[PDB]
From Swiss-Prot, chain A:
It is found in: Apical cell membrane; Cell membrane; Cell junction; Lysosome membrane. Keywords: Acetylation, Amino-acid transport, Cell junction, Cell membrane, Disulfide bond, Glycoprotein, Host cell receptor for virus entry, Isopeptide bond, Lysosome, Membrane, Phosphoprotein, Receptor, Signal-anchor, Transmembrane, Transmembrane helix, Transport, Ubl conjugation. Its main location: membrane. GO terms for biological process: amino acid transport; calcium ion transport; carbohydrate metabolic process; isoleucine transport; L-alanine import across plasma membrane; L-histidine transport; L-leucine import across plasma membrane; L-leucine transport. Disulfide-linked heterodimer with a non-glycosylated catalytic light subunit (SLC7A5, SLC7A6, SLC7A7, SLC7A8, SLC7A10 or SLC7A11). Interacts with TLCD3A/CT120. Interacts with ICAM1. Constitutively and specifically associates with beta-1 integrins (alpha-2/beta-1, alpha-3/beta-1, alpha-5/beta-1 and alpha-6/beta-1), but minimally with alpha-4/beta-1. Interacts with LAPTM4B; recruits SLC3A2 and SLC7A5/LAT1 to lysosomes to promote leucine uptake into these organelles and is required for mTORC1 activation. It comes from Homo sapiens. The chain holds residues 160 to 630 of 630 of the full protein. Coiled coil: none annotated. It comes from the Eukaryota. This is Amino acid transporter heavy chain SLC3A2. Changing N206Q: Impairs both the stability and the trafficking of SLC3A2 to the plasma membrane.
Curated annotation (Swiss-Prot), chain B:
Its main location: membrane. Residues 28-40, 98-129, 178-197, 250-273, 347, 409-413 are extracellular. GO terms for cellular component: plasma membrane. GO terms for molecular function: amino acid transmembrane transporter activity; arginine binding; basic amino acid transmembrane transporter activity; L-amino acid transmembrane transporter activity; L-arginine transmembrane transporter activity; L-lysine:L-arginine antiporter activity. This is Y+L amino acid transporter 2. It is found in: Cell membrane. The gene is SLC7A6. Residues 62-76, 151-156, 219-228, 295-325, 369-387, 435-463 are cytoplasmic.
Amino acid sequence: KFTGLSKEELLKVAGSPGWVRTRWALLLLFWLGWLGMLAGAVVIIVRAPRCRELPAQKWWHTGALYRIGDLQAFQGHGAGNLAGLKGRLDYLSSLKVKGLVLGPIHKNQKDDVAQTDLLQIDPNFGSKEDFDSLLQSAKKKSIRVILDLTPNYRGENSWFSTQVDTVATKVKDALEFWLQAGVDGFQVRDIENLKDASSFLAEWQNITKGFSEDRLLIAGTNSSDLQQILSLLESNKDLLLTSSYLSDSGSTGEHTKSLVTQYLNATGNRWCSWSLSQARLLTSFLPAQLLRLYQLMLFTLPGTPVFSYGDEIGLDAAALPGQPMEAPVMLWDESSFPDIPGAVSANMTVKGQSEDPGSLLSLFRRLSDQRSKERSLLHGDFHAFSAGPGLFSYIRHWDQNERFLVVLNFGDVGLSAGLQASDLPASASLPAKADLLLSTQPGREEGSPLELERLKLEPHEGLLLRFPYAA
Amino acid sequence: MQLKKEISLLNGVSLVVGNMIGSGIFVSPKGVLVHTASYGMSLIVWAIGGLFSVVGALCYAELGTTITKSGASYAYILEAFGGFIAFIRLWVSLLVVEPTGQAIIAITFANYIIQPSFPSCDPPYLACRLLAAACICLLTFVNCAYVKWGTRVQDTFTYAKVVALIAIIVMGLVKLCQGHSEHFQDAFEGSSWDMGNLSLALYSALFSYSGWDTLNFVTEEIKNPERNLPLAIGISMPIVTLIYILTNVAYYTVLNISDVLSSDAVAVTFADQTFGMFSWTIPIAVALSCFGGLNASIFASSRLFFVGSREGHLPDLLSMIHIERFTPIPALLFNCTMALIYLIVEDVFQLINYFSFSYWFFVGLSVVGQLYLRWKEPKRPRPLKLSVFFPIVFCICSVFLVIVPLFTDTINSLIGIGIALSGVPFYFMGVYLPESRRPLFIRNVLAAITRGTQQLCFCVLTE
Ligand SMILES: NC(=[NH2+])NCCC[C@H](N)C(=O)O
């Protein structure tokens, strides 16, 4: 038969000049191909474009914010204390927020300015040490904490209209005191009520920036016109200004489009704060069929979205009878409102909504997950293109991460999403068929790449299409 | 022209360590954290997965000193079980276990050698593939020229990555014991003690310790295969277990579970967080790791195929050896060609779904083979016989590890069974029938091509 040649042949018939020349040629062709693979690697590495620089955002960009307008009305009676709330930080981090705003915890009775200070914890809420433990547990669970320093939060006038200089001193020393304590920011409300607003607010900004650069100062005004916004936001540029600039909307697609685009063009695509008021809920200005629509926009606009307590479930202040409008009670379970029990439904509490994917709290959780983990939403650029009569359509694209497109039906009839852009940069090439992460109305399956031409938008339906880096 | 035993104790420790500590601890120590969601219980699951992998490594020390034959899952299956399942192991390690393993390790090398130039976006796929193919070709040439060159490459680069992990552990312990001790204050909170999570915790704590037997694939080339193999495994296992536990101590001291669980390159995130300057040290470290952990899947697989060609399953060609330098050239070229072929596929990272039931099935079946030997033939010359406790508990652990990818990933694992089974045609058609009964034309062309590549590859059959 046959067998592998003995070494003898490997010494005579292989060592012949022809075979050894062929072997040398094979080896040298191999090393030519290998220097070629290296040349290809090193040249294609300088062919693909460079990678844009991350703006190294603070904490208050890495997720939404969240307000506790009143500690007691959040969890309920009896446990309306900081130590009691310390348990709810397992719930809040399920919403995937990167912020929190406790209500004014300083002792305040009424107009009397000589006794109301900004340093003493109101003992009916707790003490200092339980507060520090709350802060430490929050910090441990990656949730920075803010604090509200509106002095006269029990009374019509919030800034103690009688005097303005000594209240500025209380704010002054309270900032540094609570910052040494471990708070990660501050907010004030009704700055239009405080005379010498711009200058005092700039001074407090300088204080909180001089203590650290990862601290926050959020001023809230009841204003609704962009002119007041700019006139107060000239000397201060690191100041998330939450105002009623949006809430005055008549929910018209063209109206809200012009409004958001004009706010951004006026601030030149800076970093803003998107909310409907300083401490009011969403439902205090929006119908219940409109809420999913808004909460799809607020979690995608280029800024920090700021929700009050209870707007992750659609909590209404007028559905439950005998409820104080300014500070409603959160609906944990059927026993959340022991008064007139039985009317508390199952789809109206956080518990019954936590399991349903076609609920509103599921929308909130999925959105705030797509916000606090995806690059192109965290700090990506924002560009809106025109659409049908009453739509709202834009794109969020950072460099090469998952590029998002959002479109919103601000109408009560079936609309058509034309989606003609013709103006976005080449880094924003629209795919003819785009994915779909979720929709404000159940009925369209997620994971189905849908073509970007035939779209019929039912009344109040939102779209969060996605696509990867295209060229 | 025998394979010229030229591996010391340090080189064996370097192979094992170099084969275990790869990109499995730098880019994703999350498989445990994602299913445990706490620090204390995650460290306990790491320690216990390490203990089970140590029991398995002691099982293989006993085996690799009983049989003393290369392959460690193709000879141990071979003896006491027969040709069939042996060839099945060799087939699945020729198709979708060793080619995919080396291709993925080289692709990760490419990804993390250029990552400091492409931090925030996706490196160009072309560069990834070309540089990974170039790395594989360079390592195959190194391991061809002189086995000592392969041992030196492996030793140098496992030194490099162990130094890098020492740097990580030292920075973590400095930050811990300096003034902070910040996350290790109320550990074990929020954890999940329901088996539906601890199961996957351990099962992904075991895929991080895979590779503790690379030294048993080359048992024949070891200096003293009766003392250097078990001593080498016993010097490796504590080093790898301690480095895993302490590296995760470092991570969890500096970073937070959430970010860790989010970091696709957990070690890169750690570098950015703590290494203020020199943030390009950890990408270099992961690159050197994937290199020195590729030369452990080419210095250990191309000996598997060698034993394959020696027993008669694969053509006698893969059994040849270069006359003047004593390195199994044709097996090395076969493995390089397999890896380069499996580089053409886009997204080979998904092929970790087709052998995660085959690899551990075959490790467990080698353990069952050891138990079969212990029962049937208790009179073998055994230079060490550990208590049957070790093989039996590691067999139970491997039953766990092969049932977990059968509950989930069932369609994938069954396609993996299809892949492994696809060899049985070649077996019952070309292997089982003896010589002088196989067709004359195919054997004649195999003779001609063997003569060709043997004259070209400059190699000869073992003597
Ligand atoms: N011969 C081998 N077992 N090679 C596989 C090495 C992979 C090893 N489990 C790792 O962590 O990367």
